[PDB]
Design a protein around this ligand. Sequence first.
Ligand SMILES: [K+]
Ligand SMILES: [Mg+2]
Ligand SMILES: [Mg+2]
Ligand SMILES: [Mg+2]
Ligand SMILES: [Mg+2]
Ligand SMILES: [Mg+2]
Ligand SMILES: [Mg+2]
Ligand SMILES: [Mg+2]
Ligand SMILES: [Mg+2]
Ligand SMILES: [Mg+2]
Ligand SMILES: [Mg+2]
Ligand SMILES: [Mg+2]
Ligand SMILES: [Mg+2]
Ligand SMILES: [Mg+2]
Ligand SMILES: [Mg+2]
Ligand SMILES: [Mg+2]
Ligand SMILES: [Mg+2]
Ligand SMILES: [Mg+2]
Ligand SMILES: [Mg+2]
Ligand SMILES: [Mg+2]
Ligand SMILES: [Mg+2]
Ligand SMILES: [Mg+2]
Ligand SMILES: [Mg+2]
Ligand SMILES: [Mg+2]
Ligand SMILES: [Mg+2]
Ligand SMILES: [Mg+2]
Ligand SMILES: [Mg+2]
Ligand SMILES: [Mg+2]
Ligand SMILES: [Mg+2]
Ligand SMILES: [Mg+2]
Ligand SMILES: [Mg+2]
Ligand SMILES: [Mg+2]
Ligand SMILES: [Mg+2]
Ligand SMILES: [Mg+2]
Ligand SMILES: [Mg+2]
Ligand SMILES: [Mg+2]
Ligand SMILES: [Mg+2]
Ligand SMILES: [Mg+2]
Ligand SMILES: [Mg+2]
Ligand SMILES: [Mg+2]
Ligand SMILES: [Mg+2]
Ligand SMILES: [Mg+2]
Ligand SMILES: [Mg+2]
Ligand SMILES: [Mg+2]
Ligand SMILES: [Mg+2]
Ligand SMILES: [Mg+2]
Ligand SMILES: [Mg+2]
Ligand SMILES: [Mg+2]
Ligand SMILES: [Mg+2]
Ligand SMILES: [Mg+2]
Ligand SMILES: [Mg+2]
Ligand SMILES: [Mg+2]
Ligand SMILES: [Mg+2]
Ligand SMILES: [Mg+2]
Ligand SMILES: [Mg+2]
Ligand SMILES: [Mg+2]
Ligand SMILES: [Mg+2]
Ligand SMILES: [Zn+2]
Lengths: 50, 101, 71, 119, 84
Amino acid sequence: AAQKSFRIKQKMAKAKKQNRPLPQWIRLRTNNTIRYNAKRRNWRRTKMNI
Amino acid sequence: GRVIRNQRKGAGSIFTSHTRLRQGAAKLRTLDYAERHGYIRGIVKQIVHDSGRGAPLAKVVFRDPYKYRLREEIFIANEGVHTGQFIYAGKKASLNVGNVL
Amino acid sequence: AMKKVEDGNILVFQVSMKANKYQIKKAVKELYEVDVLKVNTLVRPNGTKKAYVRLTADYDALDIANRIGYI
Amino acid sequence: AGVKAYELRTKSKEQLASQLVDLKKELAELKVQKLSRPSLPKIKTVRKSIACVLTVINEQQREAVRQLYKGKKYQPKDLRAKKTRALRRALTKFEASQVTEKQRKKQIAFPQRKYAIKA
Amino acid sequence: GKGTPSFGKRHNKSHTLCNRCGRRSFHVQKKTCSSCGYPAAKTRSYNWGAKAKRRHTTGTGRMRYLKHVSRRFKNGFQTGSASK
RNA sequence: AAACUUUCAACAACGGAUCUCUUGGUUCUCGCAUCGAUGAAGAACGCAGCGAAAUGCGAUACGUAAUGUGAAUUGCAGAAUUCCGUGAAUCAUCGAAUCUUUGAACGCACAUUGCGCCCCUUGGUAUUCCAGGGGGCAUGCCUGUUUGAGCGUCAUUU
RNA sequence: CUAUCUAGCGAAACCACAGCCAAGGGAACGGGCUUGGCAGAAUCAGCGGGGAAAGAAGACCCUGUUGAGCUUGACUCUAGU
RNA sequence: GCUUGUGACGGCCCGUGAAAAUCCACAGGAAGGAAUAGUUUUCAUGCCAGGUCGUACUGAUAACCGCAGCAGGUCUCCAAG
RNA sequence: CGUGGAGGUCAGUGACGAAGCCUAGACCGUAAGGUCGGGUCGAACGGCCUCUAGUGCAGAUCUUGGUGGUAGUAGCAAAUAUUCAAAUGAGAACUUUGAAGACUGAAGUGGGGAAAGGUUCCACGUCAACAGCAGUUGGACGUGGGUUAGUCGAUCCUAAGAGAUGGGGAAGCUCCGUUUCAAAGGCCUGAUUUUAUGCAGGCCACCAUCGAAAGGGAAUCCGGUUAAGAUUCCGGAACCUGGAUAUGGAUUCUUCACGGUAACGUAACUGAAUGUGGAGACGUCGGCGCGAGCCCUGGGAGGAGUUAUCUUUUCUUCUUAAC
RNA sequence: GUCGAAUUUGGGUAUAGGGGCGAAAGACUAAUCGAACCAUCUAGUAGCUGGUUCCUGCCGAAGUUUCCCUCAGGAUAGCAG
RNA sequence: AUAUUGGCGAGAGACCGAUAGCGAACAAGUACAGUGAUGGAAAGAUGAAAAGAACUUUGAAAAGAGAGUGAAAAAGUACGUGAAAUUGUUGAAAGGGAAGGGCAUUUGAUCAGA
Ligand SMILES: [K+]
Ligand SMILES: [Mg+2]
Ligand SMILES: [Mg+2]
Ligand SMILES: [Mg+2]
Ligand SMILES: [Mg+2]
Ligand SMILES: [Mg+2]
Ligand SMILES: [Mg+2]
Ligand SMILES: [Mg+2]
Ligand SMILES: [Mg+2]
Ligand SMILES: [Mg+2]
Ligand SMILES: [Mg+2]
Ligand SMILES: [Mg+2]
Ligand SMILES: [Mg+2]
Ligand SMILES: [Mg+2]
Ligand SMILES: [Mg+2]
Ligand SMILES: [Mg+2]
Ligand SMILES: [Mg+2]
Ligand SMILES: [Mg+2]
Ligand SMILES: [Mg+2]
Ligand SMILES: [Mg+2]
Ligand SMILES: [Mg+2]
Ligand SMILES: [Mg+2]
Ligand SMILES: [Mg+2]
Ligand SMILES: [Mg+2]
Ligand SMILES: [Mg+2]
Ligand SMILES: [Mg+2]
Ligand SMILES: [Mg+2]
Ligand SMILES: [Mg+2]
Ligand SMILES: [Mg+2]
Ligand SMILES: [Mg+2]
Ligand SMILES: [Mg+2]
Ligand SMILES: [Mg+2]
Ligand SMILES: [Mg+2]
Ligand SMILES: [Mg+2]
Ligand SMILES: [Mg+2]
Ligand SMILES: [Mg+2]
Ligand SMILES: [Mg+2]
Ligand SMILES: [Mg+2]
Ligand SMILES: [Mg+2]
Ligand SMILES: [Mg+2]
Ligand SMILES: [Mg+2]
Ligand SMILES: [Mg+2]
Ligand SMILES: [Mg+2]
Ligand SMILES: [Mg+2]
Ligand SMILES: [Mg+2]
Ligand SMILES: [Mg+2]
Ligand SMILES: [Mg+2]
Ligand SMILES: [Mg+2]
Ligand SMILES: [Mg+2]
Ligand SMILES: [Mg+2]
Ligand SMILES: [Mg+2]
Ligand SMILES: [Mg+2]
Ligand SMILES: [Mg+2]
Ligand SMILES: [Mg+2]
Ligand SMILES: [Mg+2]
Ligand SMILES: [Mg+2]
Ligand SMILES: [Mg+2]
Ligand SMILES: [Zn+2]
């Protein structure tokens, strides 16, 4: 809203920091059934609902 | 099968009185020693409109008999009462329009 | 931040989110033996705190940065 | 290889405070270096050394306070035994072994005897 | 109206984040969380809501003290040190 | 006669059945009794050389201490190979600590990272203003302490 | 501006199997059955006769010892007073 | 002239059109006050400090809601010839 | 007859290939089915005697998943509209630049904001997916950068209202009520300074708290600066609040100022309790007056355009913040 | 149609399901209204509709009697194995 | 002595074998939907070992063709097997307003038995 509470900004900061693809050195680990970031969010597809 | 309007009025959600603009409750002075035994003189400072009320109110200022200060009272103005008029309230006040007896 | 250090005599620090301007000023003074003219603070979009610490005209933020290890 | 708690334990609190200050300065300069140098794992060692020095300092302080409070009742609650809350509320061994004078007399007089059947 | 045109007037949050559970179920005007019941002392739950109980019950977090209570019991709530 | 349509076969597709797997579930039995104001369960936010999660953890932050084992960790990097050693480890064990902001949640509030008060201490001449550090201030109830109230009331002076 | 034709892109409804008629009989109005008429690949734009076309377990009517909204000196109760 | 601010007025009401924080002034005269000197931080100048959180951008025929980059919906300011 | 599992047995089959699957190839059975060959495949499985059942599918507008015909079909037609060249690139109707033609036409298709979103902002790289054509472009993808305040907001106040406490109700979760049937008080100071407190002099209480990013409200402007921040940064110039404070000035010998008839004036020019008053603080419409910005316009000092002809001409700069 | 007042509208706030709210249409109460939404009781009951999965062999019906708040059902006798 | 769909620790089964079994064998009460109470999935398998295809060549590239690794690439991370629906190619055959079917035989193809 550009006049946001610190709580909202903090959740926004966490979302920005976790908005990234899978680290590519994962998928080299020994067993590693993890293929991709299945929790990837985008502002155009799914709303954070705060 | 439904609760009717006169029944709904008792809950007082949207049926409470719109009291924002009102001047205050219109009351005589508290019945005290001065009015029980003699009289007390106040002065009419304002005759003012009260929202939701037809009759105008008179703001009458008396001296506090026990503490040095003024006590404003909200009377309902009687016809002929004017600002600057001395109102007398008590057992010994005179039979004059605006006096409290 | 490097442009600010070189041009505006302003050291740019990441500081604790619990620290206020008084704590930042006194910490910079203690850690770097430098007088602080002003501290401006913002909370970055990544949730950390960035402090623009403008030093007094006596000190040169570029040499302070050189001393503390980033040129 | 980082600091060792058993070596720290032989040092006075002044030396430990000084070592903590030096380790903090070292960590600050190491995270300055990390901004240029990529993949600098040496900072983990200094972080663990700071943790170890703080651990030993707190150990010494808490031991000194335990010595201060030795023997007298009313120790500080974080120095008292942390059993469960119900266990700390439970009757002590002295209580729940308290018996009336009547009960003591009668169970002294007639305890459970040892007896076998021998035919 | 009442469909697509009326959906355009949805910009005022009835609920915001709850301090206790973080679920965005704290009714702004009622000042009450519809999920955990904050600020009531008890945590809202119902036996008709077995799935919700399962969602929010003990063990759904990290348990942070209780995960060690069992080992401490096993060792008898000892208090000293292992004495090399 | 082609094309086209249809049927079948082979190979290729589509799709993920079947078969065989199984660190999962389900049911039965046996043993045990241990959450929390010494702050629980739950929540938020952070923490790794390179992690978004799961898991672990709390500014001592995938951990500190202690003990045991005895040479790893491993995806890369780095370190190390004294490793015949108070000593590797994303090991096990775990009795000592740390344990952000919270939460029954406790100075007052909380759609605010809002606003006080007390003590010690430090700096700015500084009991009074501002700031930093440390320690505190919820409610009900119980035992006790101290200070009190009531012609409720006793005695003495009167 | 479409429709139309092209390059690119590219759904859905619906679909027992399908698709030329006439009469017959038939669940008394057939695309199939019987008897006839006939009948030649593959198709394009239109069209609204038919597919008793599609859309929906008919909302009318009836049945159910299936309800619900409403009413009333129906039966049985009840807050209040 | 337009937009806007404002002043003095006028019309209207069985409508007469918030509250509190906060600031000032007055009444009063408590108290405190001068003579090798007392008084005065509502006069002037001079010294120090002012924490915390928000702050980018869109605000819509593509940044909100409507399953979407949906001809829908969604409050307001400025406004040239 | 067949299927999953179970007891027994055939010292059954099997990596020299179990199971599964495919096979207009063969055999047996009326049939349910059984057997064999070939191909594929890779780790188990079968005959018989018995035991047992979550044991046999074509349907249930069956369930889940997958796939068709329809069909390269319906269609991708509102919002006037695009065109030329160059550059880039493997590739250009759609990207970039230039040129042209248009539109929104200030109640905008402009410049900002509130709610909401949450990084969409900006740069670099970059086109598998997405942008119902395309794509070298993008609100996409990948990596980073970016939001600076004593003065703008929140913070403070109260509004409708919400809501602890004291009490009362309720089995109870809890409900009522908000100053009420309460012993609900701190801030001042003579003295005490055995210490500025306790005792001990004296003055004021019908009461938590929450509730507005549009109400009320202490105080900041101009210029410049970024890829992206600006009333926040830089430069300059102010202001307010809280505090500390020393000079100058003022006042006093008639101690707490003088002047003016007066309205009142000023650089000041003591003032506790208590009280009173004012501001905060207020509707709407109408015409009239005034200001500011804009519009129009004259001269002049500059720059640009037109100039076959005419046009002392058409357009444009000439500004001044808070304090 | 209306367009300066029974006006339009933002935000805040109150009213919650046999309840609210209604200038009254059984309207509106988050695409839900002649009783919202969510979960549970609940796999609610159904004389009613649909379906009900291998082969072969042998035998092989009834739509009638009586009774029923029975007439789309059951009991009973009959027919069948 | 009795209870125990919770907690902790154990042992089992004529149980289920990824549409089954808990909703969840997997970063499952997750992703996601809803204002909210709540609702709530899908998703396991290369190979013994990545030995995860060096190198050449065509292509802007994706990729292709080779080469190679491997027991196998008829195992290439779009990975065990790899059904059917549906589809391409090749081969065969038939075809005047459906197709399919029964009895019988011709023709073509194919095949067991002595
Ligand atoms: K009804
Ligand atoms: Mg700031
Ligand atoms: Mg509706
Ligand atoms: Mg609301
Ligand atoms: Mg804690
Ligand atoms: Mg016919
Ligand atoms: Mg006929
Ligand atoms: Mg037909
Ligand atoms: Mg015929
Ligand atoms: Mg034909
Ligand atoms: Mg037509
Ligand atoms: Mg027709
Ligand atoms: Mg029907
Ligand atoms: Mg129906
Ligand atoms: Mg009947
Ligand atoms: Mg009924
Ligand atoms: Mg206007
Ligand atoms: Mg901005
Ligand atoms: Mg903007
Ligand atoms: Mg705009
Ligand atoms: Mg959207
Ligand atoms: Mg089974
Ligand atoms: Mg085989
Ligand atoms: Mg076949
Ligand atoms: Mg195998
Ligand atoms: Mg079955
Ligand atoms: Mg089937
Ligand atoms: Mg059937
Ligand atoms: Mg079906
Ligand atoms: Mg289906
Ligand atoms: Mg078309
Ligand atoms: Mg169209
Ligand atoms: Mg158009
Ligand atoms: Mg262009
Ligand atoms: Mg136009
Ligand atoms: Mg135009
Ligand atoms: Mg951009
Ligand atoms: Mg496209
Ligand atoms: Mg494309
Ligand atoms: Mg991006
Ligand atoms: Mg302000
Ligand atoms: Mg209440
Ligand atoms: Mg407030
Ligand atoms: Mg305001
Ligand atoms: Mg900007
Ligand atoms: Mg400045
Ligand atoms: Mg003077
Ligand atoms: Mg009607
Ligand atoms: Mg059933
Ligand atoms: Mg027979
Ligand atoms: Mg009967
Ligand atoms: Mg029937
Ligand atoms: Mg499952
Ligand atoms: Mg598979
Ligand atoms: Mg093989
Ligand atoms: Mg395969
Ligand atoms: Mg097939
Ligand atoms: Zn909650």
